[PDB]
């Protein structure tokens, strides 16, 4: 695997919508096929079938599976066996052990809980790890909070603290660093500012949830 | 103990002023009877006697004892034996061991030194721990600094870093998270902003030093 | 050694320019003779000779050597043997072991990489350590970034996170804390603000790269 060779534009795409796969792969540098919150709890088995019969370039495609310890992740690995994918994205990554149990595939840990932020280095250190990502939304939620950004749009302090935390963790161990998804899709000004900053700080990628986000991300990382 | 069931409004009240106990308990969700810097070094033995003959609901009352390794903390535990209190707040909490030696009572660790911030997770992990709190004032002081806030009123960076640090530590281990006391009592605008933010970020409590602070705190955590 | 007794004004001075040594020592509280990036890769052997025949007060002088594991650091220690200097500054300090191998001399660790920030406490804990310093420029560079400050001049978040990280690390272990060099020499307003803040937060020193920077630093730490 050499996802570092790919551009900075990564895009999420629900695994239950195989019709969009082709467009997504063509629009992004890397496509993250989602089996998690991007697919209804009743559409998962469908998304798993589509993940099989509708193949995508394993060179530029990662599969986001479900959280460690769940039944859905178990079903995800079973469905992943019938594909040529080697890299998985683990949500709510909270320990090296959750990463290790995914060996021998490559794992991008998505830190989005307090325990994960606290064990960020341990997670980035694990052998299977090839990338570190963070998410503000589940972070604030699992914290018992209700807002990741303040009035002025800027992320709250805890989220900023974590962003810097996973950047250092990922870097300290030669892992790829992925910046958080800009949830307000129509807010391209905001995305541009975060992406520019992410480029300037060392992040290698900024994940997008909408194809319209890719060109702004690719431009912010231009130079 | 179930202090989580109590409201977000916690209030400090010097143990040498038993006359105010009743008013305090009635005004706050939880009352922190203080045996530390809230009582003159010569009024401590008095505060200890008042802690005995003037009982308060052990369900909504915690006792802040003195720092680990001191003679005063020793005298505090002895005086605490003659009461129905189970939860203590430990100032200058700098290690799991300082928490552990307070077993079998429940402990809320108050991180307010560099060593404590550095060992925040170790402290939150300890078995006796049921809550994590932070304080900017002793933090800057023990750091050799002289100001916790900058011109614009906002906390300096080191303090903000620590605030986020104890929030993640406390949360990662299912502990209660208490935000720092707003020292400028008449500045309700400032308190409102910090409390709102604390509510939004996951803090479960914002400690107050004055009864007039409680209603603003309770409102900020409204929704 | 008692560098804490010295003023807050520390100044870098290339070891290949022995003519300036005298002026530098007279202008600063402590002089950091540089054998690293402050001297051309071809002028190093010259700087090493000048470090020998042109002595400076070992009480107020530290020598910045080259990174652990390099040939240049090896040549630096050999040249350092013929001098009365006891304290060295280690760039790209990334572990306790890199510090330990410099025993028995005193070491000021300069954290300026992700691994170093991640192991900040381990480094500050090492026996040889007497000081902790940080640098934004190599930090962003080694991170794969390209800018340590944002449009408004303020340091980017990752750099601010690290600054606070080495302050707590150094303090938690009774080490001296040195704030980052203000690269824009003619920007005295900016330096004044950072130095004032550093004074207020607990930093004991603010390193300068130009003699004109010392008086502003000394004034910011006045009170
Ligand atoms: O589902 C999404 O689109 C994004 C998501 O879960 C996350 O960032 O954690
Ligand atoms: O004494 C007080 O009122 C508050 C205090 O010590 C602290 O926050 O650490
Ligand atoms: O060379 C200089 O002048 C400053 C430097 O390397 C650093 O701060 O790391
Ligand atoms: Mg998520
Ligand atoms: Mg205190
Ligand atoms: Mg450098």
Q: Which residues sit opposite C61 in a β-bridge?
A: C31
Q: Is B37 in the pocket of ligand 2 (CB under 6 A)?
A: yes
CA distance A199 to chain C (A): 6
Distance between CA C98 and CA A13 in Å, rounded?
45
Cα distances from A175 to residues A3, A126, A130, A168, C143, in angstroms, run 11, 10, 5, 10, 11
Residue B74's H or E segment, with its range, is: helix B71-80
Q: What is the distance between the alpha carbons of residues B105 and B73, in angstroms, rounded to a whole number?
A: 14
- Tell me the C-alpha distance between C186 and C211, whole Å: 11
Alpha helices (H) in chain C, listed in sequence order: 18-27, 44-53, 71-80, 96-100, 114-118, 120-125, 136-143, 157-172, 188-201, 214-220
Among the atoms of ligand 2, which is closest to the Cα of residue B110? Answer: 9
C174 Cα distance to chain centroid: 17
Method: X-ray
Written as six digits, the tokens of A25 are 């792969």
Q: What is the dihedral of CA A83, A85, A90, A91, to 10 degrees?
A: -70
Gap from CA of B136 to ligand 5 centroid (Å): 8
Structural domains of chain C ordered from first start: 2-223 (3.20.20.60)
DSSP codes joined into one string, C7-56: -SEEEEEETT-HHHHHHHHHHSSEEEEE-STTS-TTTHHHHHHHHHHS--
B197 lines ligand 2 (CB under 6 A): no
Q: Which of C104, C150, C147 is nearest to C127 (CA)?
A: C104
Write the burial class of residue A53 (CB in 10 Å: 0-12 exposed, 13-18 middle, 19+ buried): exposed
In this structure, the residue with its CA closest to atom 6 of ligand 3 is C37
Ligand nearest to the CA of C207: 3
Q: Do C145 and A201 touch (CB under 8 A)?
A: yes
On the 0-12 / 13-18 / 19+ scale of CB atoms within 10 A, A104 is exposed
Report yes or no: C70 and C94 within 8 Å, Cβ to Cβ: no
Closest of B66, B164, C216, C175 to residue A139, by C-alpha: B164
Å resolution of this model? 2.3
Chains touching A (at least 3 CB pairs under 8 A) are B, C
Tokens for B73, please give them.
């903390």
Backbone CA torsion sign across B29, B33, B37, B43: positive
Q: How many residues does chain A have?
A: 223
Q: Which of B115, B145, B161 is closest, CB to CB, to C172?
A: B115
Task: Write down the residue that tokens 């600063």 correspond to.
Answer: C28
Nearest CA-CA distance, residue B165 and chain A, Å: 8
Pairing state between β A61-64 and A30-34: parallel
Residue B22: C-alpha distances to residues A85, B56, B61, C11 (Å): 66, 8, 12, 59
Mapped onto helix, strand or coil, the DSSP state of residue A53 is helix
């Amino acid at each position: 695997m050499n996802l570092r060779a790919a551009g900075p534009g990564w895009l999420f795409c629900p695994a239950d919508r195989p019709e969009r796969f082709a467009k997504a792969a063509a629009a992004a540098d890397v496509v993250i096929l989602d089996l998690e919150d991007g697919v209804a709890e009743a559409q998962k088995p469908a998304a798993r079938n589509a993940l099989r019969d509708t193949p995508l370039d394993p060179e530029r495609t990662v599969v986001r599976i479900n959280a460690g310890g769940t039944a859905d992740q178990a079903r995800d690995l079973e469905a992943l066996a019938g594909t040529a994918y080697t890299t998985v994205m683990l949500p709510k990554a909270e320990s090296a052990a959750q990463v290790i149990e995914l060996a021998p595939r490559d794992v991008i840990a998505l830190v989005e809980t307090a325990r994960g932020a606290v064990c960020a280095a341990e997670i980035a250190a694990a052998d299977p790890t090839v990338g570190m990502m963070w998410g503000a939304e589940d972070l604030i939620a699992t914290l018992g909070g209700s807002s990741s950004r303040r009035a002025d749009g800027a992320y709250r302090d805890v989220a900023r603290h974590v962003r810097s935390t996973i950047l250092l963790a990922a870097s300290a161990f030669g892992r790829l660093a992925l910046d958080a998804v800009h949830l307000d899709i129509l807010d391209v000004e905001g995305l541009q500012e975060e992406a520019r900053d992410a480029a300037a700080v060392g992040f290698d990628v900024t994940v997008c949830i909408h194809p319209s986000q890719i060109p702004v991300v690719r431009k912010a990382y231009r130079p």
